[PDB]
From a paper:
Here we describe the two-component-like orphan response regulator RitR (Repressor of iron transport Regulator) as the archetype of a novel family of peroxide-sensing transcription factors in the pneumococcus and related species. RitR contains an Aspartate-less Receiver (ALR) REC-like domain, which retains the common (α/β) fold of canonical REC versions, yet lacks “invariant” residues in its catalytic pocket required for typical phosphotransfer, including the phospho-accepting Asp residue crucial for the histidine kinase-response regulator phosphorelay.. Here we show that RitR regulates pneumococcal iron homeostasis in response to cellular peroxide concentrations through its single Cys (Cys128) located within the linker domain of the protein.
The X-ray crystal structure of the full-length reduced state mimic RitRC128S was determined to 1.7 Å resolution with selenomethionine (Se-Met) Single Wavelength Anomalous Diffraction (SAD) method. Thus, to eliminate any heterogeneity caused by this phenomenon, we mutated the redox-active cysteine residue (Cys128) to serine, which would be unable to oxidize and activate the protein. The resulting RitRC128S exhibited no evidence of dimerization in solution using both SEC and 2-dimensional nuclear magnetic resonance (NMR) techniques. The RitRC128S (Se-Met) mutant crystallized in space group C2 with two molecules in the asymmetric unit. These molecules are nearly identical with root mean square deviations of 0.69 Å for all Cα atoms, are independent, and do not form a dimer with each other, nor with any symmetry-related molecule. However, more positive charges are visibly present in PhoB, as RitR contains several aromatic amino acids in these same positions, which are also (notably) able to hydrogen bond with DNA. Finally, we observe that the trans-activation loop (colored magenta in Fig 3), responsible for the binding and direct recruitment of RNA polymerase, would be inaccessible to RNAP in the RitRC128S structure. Combined with the fact that RitR requires oxidation to bind and repress Piu transcription, from these studies we can be fairly confident that the RitRC128S structure is reflective of the inactive, reduced state. The most unique and striking feature of the RitRC128S structure is the α5 helix linker, which connects the REC and DBD sections of the protein.
Numbering used by the authors: 2 to 230
Amino acid sequence: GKRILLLEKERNLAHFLSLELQKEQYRVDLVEEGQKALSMALQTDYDLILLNVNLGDMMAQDFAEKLSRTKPASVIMILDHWEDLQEELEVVQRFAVSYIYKPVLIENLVARISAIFRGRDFIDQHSSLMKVPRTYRNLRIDVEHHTVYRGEEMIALTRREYDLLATLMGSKKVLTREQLLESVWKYESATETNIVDVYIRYLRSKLDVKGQKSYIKTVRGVGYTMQEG
């Protein structure tokens, strides 16, 4: 089964989530602080890393940035109280594939994790069919390693940003926000179209060079497409 790295500060909840996730045949490694979580995530490829906003010895944002130096498309999901998540909402959107509020309902957590895994699988399969060369202007995508480069620099795209780029680069046509939702949030049927604009903004911030045309064009009345220089 897929492998989950789990850090939950509430002891009884951590134990509960560990046991319930193993009933889905997932392999669950429970850790209690970020330093240990980080050493484990650096040496093992986890399919999901499930964290609180604050890991105790560091913020989850800090963990994610440090992990991203070698594994930029890591799949991190944040579980926390509403007030804790909202205090850090913008930074959480930037590094996490999803977030979920306490008090958690296990059937909901299980369904969401399943959908996230299936959506990543879809992206992988679809991107394997991308026309070669997988380049655009100064960008190149390494589909095997889920990495992106602009010139000779690695661009630390998050998993959502990577999935969004692969979807845009793999399309010959302008894509609507509904079509982008259907590809990048596939199987996460509760996702709504305004999230697409958020991640287009994030993706532009990572790709774009000041004084060049953006890598992504907004097409009036339609949606988004890659943009030439």
